[PDB]
């Protein structure tokens, strides 16, 4: 997250931190995700496609720091890794960038809701806020595009939804943005998602519910004028989600 503010997991208690175990036992951060039910985390397929074996991943909930433990946190193995069949990546962007992880503790349990671990609601089908609406993004991604390191402390910021017409201007991304994607950005382009925020939640208030509106997917640079962040449009994937979680 470029700009924005540091936060803690109580402010985004559905946030899941996803790591990958390596050849030698070392463990590195992969992507964010969101807890949509006690056994299911939703994220992006591009986070997993290069190493698609479920055994190589660990998921934490209730975690506020990247490489240190947070009191109350829970650690999970991945019982099932479900990637979207129609995923693609071009030279620029990702399509159908959505993924589901079924989580299970070494004791065979799912998540236990607490002050630091809660689920987020899915949206009504094809139901999205008006453009101009302010939404939150959360992640352990880079604080600056040129940084080598990731922040140790979770961050969050606010961006506004951009109309599909505006985002599809060649001025922005042209045809690379589809109806199954959502664009959001800061009016001054001063805050944004960045490298390592992928898979994480874009959360808006529709009616009176905090709702998972998007999943961090792609973008040209970070906090770059006329280059918004692009998000998987969750309200367009409800049959796929329900079908695979039933």
């Amino acid at each position: 997250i470029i700009g924005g503010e540091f936060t803690t997991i109580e402010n985004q208690p559905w946030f899941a931190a996803i790591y990958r175990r390596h050849r030698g036992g070392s463990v590195t951060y992969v992507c964010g995700g969101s807890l949509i039910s006690p056994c299911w985390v939703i994220s992006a397929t591009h986070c997993f496609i290069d190493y698609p074996k479920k055994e190589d991943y660990i998921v934490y909930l209730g975690r506020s720091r990247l490489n240190s433990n947070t009191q109350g946190e829970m650690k999970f193995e991945v019982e099932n890794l479900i990637l979207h069949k129609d995923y693609s990546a071009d030279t620029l962007a990702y399509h159908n960038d959505i993924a589901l992880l079924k989580i299970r503790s070494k004791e065979g349990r799912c998540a236990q809701p607490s002050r630091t671990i809660q689920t987020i609601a899915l949206p009504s089908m094809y139901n999205d806020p008006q453009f101009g609406t302010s939404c939150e993004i959360t992640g352990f991604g880079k604080e600056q595009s040129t940084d080598y390191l990731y922040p140790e402390q979770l961050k969050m910021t606010v961006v506004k939804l951009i109309s599909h017409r505006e985002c599809q201007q060649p001025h922005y991304y042209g045809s690379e943005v589809t109806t199954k994607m959502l664009c959001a950005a800061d009016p001054q382009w001063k805050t944004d998602s960045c490298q390592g925020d992928s898979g994480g939640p874009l959360v808006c208030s529709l009616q009176g519910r905090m709702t998972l509106t998007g999943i961090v997917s792609w973008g040209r640079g970070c906090a770059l004028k006329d280059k918004p962040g692009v998000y998987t449009r969750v309200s367009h994937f409800l049959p796929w989600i329900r079908s695979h979680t039933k």
Partner: peptide, 10 residues
Amino acid sequence: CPAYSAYLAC
């Protein structure tokens, strides 16, 4: 890796 990726391994 696509050019506009935010995957940390890219």
